């Protein structure tokens, strides 16, 4: 159906930047979104950052402006541009993609997932 692979993982010091990024791959003519989430240490996944096919962005409370996520239809990825980073953004990040396929008999909705990159960042 549609696979996803991640890269960009780091260890930075407060303040600096890295930069995540996700390619998709077989049906990606049916992705509506690309999204991040992130689990921190001890928590819960939790959403941080959506972009739709028509290009709407929306990012969790706890962004505040600091990252950028795009869509790459050359090369069918997303990507999150990390900046101004905190301890607190210390967390495990995941890649999704969202949309709907036909699977022979039906529309059906359908979510994907990358295996996730390790971000740490320290004082």
């Known amino acids: 159906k549609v696979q996803l692979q991640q890269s960009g993982g780091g260890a930075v010091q407060t303040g600096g930047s890295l930069k995540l990024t996700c390619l998709a791959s077989?049906?990606?003519?049916?992705?509506?979104?690309m999204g991040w989430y992130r689990r921190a240490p001890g928590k819960q996944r939790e959403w941080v950052a959506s972009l739709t096919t028509t290009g709407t962005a929306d990012y969790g409370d706890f962004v505040k402006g600091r990252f950028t996520i795009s869509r790459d239809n050359a090369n069918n990825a997303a990507t999150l541009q990390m900046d101004s980073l905190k301890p607190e953004d210390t967390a495990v990040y995941y890649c999704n993609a969202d949309g709907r396929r036909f699977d022979g008999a039906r529309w059906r909705e359908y979510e994907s997932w990358g295996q996730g990159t390790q971000v740490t960042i320290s004082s």
């Open positions: 077989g049906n990606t003519a049916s992705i509506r979104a």
